[model samples]
Target: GLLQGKRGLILGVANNRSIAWGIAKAAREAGAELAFTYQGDALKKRVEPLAEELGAFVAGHCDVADAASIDAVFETLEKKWGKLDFLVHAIGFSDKDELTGRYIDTSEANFTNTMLISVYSLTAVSRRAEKLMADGGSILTLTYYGAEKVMPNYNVMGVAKAALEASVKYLAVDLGPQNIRVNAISAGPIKTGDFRYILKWNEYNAPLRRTVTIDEVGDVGLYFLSDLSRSVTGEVHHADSGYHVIGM
Candidate 1:
């Protein structure tokens, strides 16, 4: 029971196949009470049953694009738990049009939306999550090597992730005085319900012989959230095995 008696809130879980769902599973198994948030009714239908299965304390709607939605969800949490010990924000998005080919051609609308959802949302969530964690807590987000290396087909999402990673470092300083920790997990490309595209290239080319698994990424999430990483803060942990290390 590494997280014994702790309460965790996992935002952006779309379904059982999402990275956030994986973290939720590991958190619940480690003795933490869990709650979840979805973007809309469509996602709600997918998340509610899974939330029930994990015995999550509650489920609510939170749209990062809407400040009101973000505030409303946190208010609900304040009413329900009053305090949170851990938070996982596995959310990112970019227009499908920008995922391939030229990076400079990303539409302004999509670029702003990508920054709002994928980058600024981390800042928004951290501030709100910090308020509910006066006694100290852990915050984790997802990032990628594409941000640093300009991987093929990553495009605008790559720029967004780079900004998200920088925010993690800055947020760590802002919350460090209260002992709150902020970190990002640079997970190996894994196939989630919405992100199977990430592993499409690796499926045929990677040296590991197989693509990364959601469970392995979840395991890294567990380590960062638990006391095993008490000294860890303002850092990005790469969970991509040797993939990120191998230069081709």
Candidate 2:
């Protein structure tokens, strides 16, 4: 390991199936100590076992919508770790109703909620993370191809991811002088609670002719979060099994 002696926090892990969980597992195996947060009670139970499995510290509830919740997690990290080396942000959301509808059909409430949780939270987290990363570090967030191109039934989420991608660039610049790097992993589709149609489409059409696994994305996560990418920043690296290159 490249991450030996590193300490970091991971946000947005819903279960073992979550991409964040995969990254957490990889980071743990690579010798990085980790801390995790749960959004609510139900997820708290799920996240606790996963965190325990990785021997990671549990920072407590952290609802991205609640600034205080985010604050509490950072406060715990500051009190315990003193500083942080990296960050993994893998949170996003949109109303399922809006997900299947036309972009114009997206309601104002859902749009605002989607942007707040999916896009602005990254920036909010980055602002707090900057202080803890006084020694300079890497920050990795997840995005998707929909941000770069239209996809059926991905309405508001697509717009949010686009904004998230842009934020990565701006954050990288803002944090650069401090030796901090900000980047995004635009991952290929992975089977989860939603997006079955998208996943099947990727499997049939992608250059690899299949969707990616959480472990594959985790490997890329290690790269961005470690010295391997010390010279890289403000990048939206695709981990989509070449799907982003397809024309038809």
Candidate 3:
């Protein structure tokens, strides 16, 4: 209801459990018209069905690693709607091999690749989205607590996320005068991909005694994308069920 008549682009929906999908579902339920992008054919199959489920349109494949591919998606968005209301950036990557090692051991290649996709891509998309957001809009991205502190096995991603949070602040300031707000959600662990241990660890330690669900993160995303947070910008709001404030 709050987002009725809003048009948004959702990037990175790998599967049903992805944070992006959760946000997409909520946005649709709240009456936002949505579009999606997938990385490649493999993910396209998966994302398309999920998009259809929510009555969302597809913006076609978008690989953030390729600037042209990213540009094409935005081009499609501009043509389809001429104006945009919001954007959800839930894409990030690091070589799986690099995800488990010490930060000191990180290679220059992986470091560059990780930062390019996880950090700079936001700015890239924002620059393009800025044009389409002539009337101003909101942009939301996903982050993690590891960005703020050391977490085992999070390695380079932690550093990347730190940069991402910083980017959110700077982008917010740059876009604020135009009435566009930029923010990120620092979400807690969910049982997705190969991180079951992370789920158990959060359940045992967080004050809530459980990891958060994608749906929960989705609700938080709804807040950031809607008029409810019109006064909010450049914030890394945590949706980690109180895990972010815990002490050893």
Candidate models: Cα lDDT each: 0.85, 0.92, 0.93
- Tens digit of per-residue lDDT, candidate 1, span 1-248: 88889888898888787678888898889888998888888888888888898898654788888998888888988889999899999988888856865988888999999999999998998889888999999999999888888887788988999999999999999998898999999977875423666576566556664677778788889888898998999998887755676676
> Ten consecutive residues with minimal summed lDDT in candidate 3?
191-200
For model 2, give the 10-residue run with minimal summed lDDT.
Answer: 189-198
lDDT of 2 by residue, 1-248 (tens): 98999999999887898789889999888999999999899888888888889998998899999999999999999999999999999999899877877899899999999999999999999999999998999999999999999978789899999999999999999999999999999999887635787789899999998899999999899999889999999999999989999989
Model 3 pairs in collision = none
lDDT of 2 at 122: 92
Instruction: Give candidate 2 regions above 4 Å deviation.
Output: none
- Whole-structure CA lDDT of model 3: 0.93
lDDT order of candidates, top first: 3, 2, 1
Per residue, candidate 3 scores C-alpha lDDT tens digits across 31-117 of: 999999989998888888988998888998898989999889989989999988999999899878877767899999999999999
TM-score of 1: 0.94
- What's each prediction's TM-score? 0.94, 0.97, 0.97
Which runs of model 3 end up more than 4 angstroms from their true locations?
none
